[model samples]
Target: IIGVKEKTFEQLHKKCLEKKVLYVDPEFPPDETSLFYSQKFPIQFVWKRPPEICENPRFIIDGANRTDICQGELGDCWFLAAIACLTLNQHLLFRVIPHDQSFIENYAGIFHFQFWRYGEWVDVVIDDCLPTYNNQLVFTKSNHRNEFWSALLEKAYAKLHGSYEALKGGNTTEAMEDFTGGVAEFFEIRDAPSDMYKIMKKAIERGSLMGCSIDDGYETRMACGLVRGHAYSVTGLDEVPFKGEKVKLVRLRNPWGQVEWNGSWSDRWKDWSFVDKDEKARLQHQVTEDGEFWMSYEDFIYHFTKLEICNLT
Candidate 1:
């Protein structure tokens, strides 16, 4: 990996300066009309610079925390789930966002993120111009409203796929593959191997990106603490001693940053008593309504319809 500076910040900075290119908000206004069209809602996009959108926006805030990612009006949960899965591994995340560039140090109104296309990785450059409606972001937003890395990263991804619309309906596995030069394998919960739980546990321990989605039908957007037709990141797996047996659980995160599962083993659920107090303390489990929750592996297998894992190795 020594000579593998496939795309560097210095290289992109020089290219943007040499070409005098200024990034534009890809999903808004004239571009929005053509790029993101709707027969139901008449749309208009407002474009603004980084300063107008956020004061002193950093390229990354505390590296890439999954909590920092939130899906906006766009139906790109597939992409957001891929992002959440990637944030767990700093080595891989830094590959997409070079460490050298930042809004303060290289404030040229331009940025870039690398994505895998076909058989190779390619750097996609974008401008800091973001779309806002009523002074609020229209696309991806962060838990901290002013943080803009999630939005900037989304813009670069849109450019890579030709337009924001192109990213509207994608598989999490596809996006996961794009983030890392790896193979994405999708499995159906009903037909997964007998050792599916063990397989998932191994994948998590090895730092693979994993995601799961429900079937595409629902009367309400959310029910029983789960969202319908939405993609979610599988953040962790654990087995703890409880009631003379080992309980298996999986942790999931909703990209929206709220609305978590309220089932058994969920935050503040009575099921926590089954876990050893020492083990619970060691895990540092918090009972907040912050979009992260745990469920028995049995419940996870029953609820989620699709599972995708991208093995970077």
Candidate 2:
């Protein structure tokens, strides 16, 4: 039998109303009675009602794709980036979004996600309650407006560490550690050994999760076409031939799913022209404005300040 018992939605809702629990809106525990207050902002926050299942909802609308996770109001991109890397591995994905969960089966206002805390893997239960401002999701959301896995995952993580405010700023390794029972190896691009690029490739091959971030407040939030102080999920490492020579390229995805590096090897970069049709077909490469983009290994090393590689072994 597993150590952490699975929590049920029916049981939690009964408890919530029995002893009124505060609805989490991602920031500091707000004025308890009135969940949203314009005094904080011009239109402070407007959540007319608590969370409810969207008409005909699905726990996973299409399927768990790395692009499904998107960051929202708060700065939990580290956690979202970790989740993007986690979904690439089915074994880890199932562990985080348990197969037993669905909006239909238990049909309650509660959900559970498992995480590896300090040392033990545990199941965390949370109400499906959510907040919205101007009728838009206030936090992490899936590509499908109805899907709630991303939001639920964030809520569980927030609950684990006290409040949603607690997760404001954190390292991807910390989020990665909670999602998987693994330790993170931190690295600096400038100090890395010569074979660092090769090691990054090997790490992904072994189903490890990795993330990189741009320096915050460095250059008006956008540095060389990329967002500064933002976390990016490392999607792939490739050595594509360019101009008769092999060139290393690092693929990364912005948590927000847009705004990318428009430099060499980017989605629209001229270097992609060198890649043959068959190779592109095999890679199923689609050039779009989506957050995912490829950066020349040299450019990645130069622009990105930090990297976190999680070893699942």
Candidate 3:
């Protein structure tokens, strides 16, 4: 809650049910001011509810996956990258996004999400109204148009921190820490430890959230199809047997949901033929353009500039 008189989700929901009306947040209203702090952009926005945006709007469609998060016009890929990592662990995801609430079950037009602020969990309540231009969302959206959990979650997070414009540029570690209340350790790839690959593998095995990025100031797309100054979620790590040696691979997912790494161990790499079909199946290998791909550990350290590991402990 932001103010002293700010009502809880239960309180406001029950009141709306008794009066037979939809919820409209008194604290964070659906207006231009809530969308941005400064009037820089001249684009006109219309606030619409989920039902107005899509006919069969569902809070969650099927289940949450890393591909569910797709960046909109907002430059908050750092937050979306962390969200991609959050989808890997259902238990932790439930802690931040409660499983009990839904658009069908409650139908109060009000939704709430929890975020770790400082040392406590802050419950952020918001209405279903979202900013849209030309009847389409202008911020974070899901691949499935009817699925709205990701969009609503983004609104609640924006309300937590001033406005949507406040989330322009940020580090994934900051958002990851806000989601899990976990401590994050950052590492410069060039100065990383000798056992960095083992540490990353252990972190993934232990269910830690991790993210990586190239540190170039401009948003430059490298020759390997990776965008510099862009955030990516570290989803998996593996060691594959190649010839007489073990080759380490790291899996990364772009929040944009496309334009994956096109390097030595990319999805369509010719070297994959050397690995057995059973091993490829075990590694969940697929040649889809879903923004996920693997790269050799040698290439990972060489291309990426920074790494962030958010440990739950």
Candidate 4:
């Protein structure tokens, strides 16, 4: 929990900005490197929803199936948010999944993933730069073929993290700025941040995105609460619901796998029992047992899951 002496907004902001928290490279290199492949590249900003859609299957609201892994324990919902937005577009998902059929056939279908960061999507022209799970070739037994492999990929992503730790706790707006790629702008959650809520509602209506949120009411000392606790996605929501609703299983996911609803619709996900015994509880999660606090289509559109949706080999 961020239970230091009470801090003014300035003090909180100042702490997150500290180099240890959010590093500021004064010697930042010029944009010599290209992000989307080509500095003098063509401008191709085409906004279109993805083509794939799951047959209306119900999903856990905390987004358990969209990806086998989670938000990578990174507090940067901004990054998680970017994953959410991209869930609306599959061309973006391809950027990470191996596109070269030859490489897959050659490695017996064991290909590494590459998320877009620092431009060019990490091209070393050799396996050395291709990355392994925790510097090992086989991170899990059925890695390339099972859930463990997905877990391996998640750990590797963390190694490349630009400080995904929520250790540098800031507000939700700060999280959005940090996770999503952009110029730093201050974002404070207002009494009714309709855009996020609307995005949640719209995504499911069109079957394009998935998401979820961490309640603002959870105590600051819990696992998710120790750092920036709230998170949302650009993807839609999972659709496994109770009491006459479907909490659909479609969403961009955060690898951290925590964060519960602090809302009335959340049912009763707010509690220490959530993280003290069950998978939802022992792991510091937000899933409620009575089928209340769910991750539904409504939440998924504006919330996030780890960037986990994919056709794994």
RMSD of each: 4.8, 5.1, 2.1, 18.1
Answer with 2 or 4, whichever has the higher lDDT.
2
Q: Which of candidates 1 and 2 is the stronger one according to TM-score?
A: 1
**Each model's backbone clash number:** 1, 1, 0, 57
Q: TM-scores, in order shown?
A: 0.88, 0.84, 0.95, 0.37
Model 1 C-alpha lDDT per residue in residues 60-132, reported as the tens digit of each score: 7766789889887788889999999999987899888766767776466766678778778787666677777
Give the per-residue lDDT of model 2 (tens digit) for 105-179.
Answer: 645455678888768878777656655676767777887777777877876787777666667778899988988
- Model 3 regions lying over 4 Å from their true place: 1-4
Top TM-score model: 3
Can you tell me which runs of candidate 2 are displaced by over 4 Å? 1-43, 46-53, 217-220
Candidate topping lDDT? 3
Better of 1 and 3 by TM-score: 3
Angstrom error of the Cα, residue 84, model 4: value is: 6.1
lDDT of 3 by residue, 1-313 (tens): 1232656778887877887777888777999778889744468789999889877789888888887898888889899999999998888998889777777765878888999997999899898999998888878888888888999999999998778888887999999999999999999998999999999989988889999999975267788889999999999999889988999999999898889889788999998999988889988999998889989899999999999999996
Q: lDDT value for candidate 4? A: 0.32
Candidate 4 segments exceeding 4 Å error: 1-65, 71-88, 99-105, 108-110, 115-145, 155-186, 191-196, 199-230, 234-259, 267-313
Candidate 4, TM-score vs. the true structure?
0.37
**Candidate lDDT values, in order:** 0.78, 0.74, 0.88, 0.32
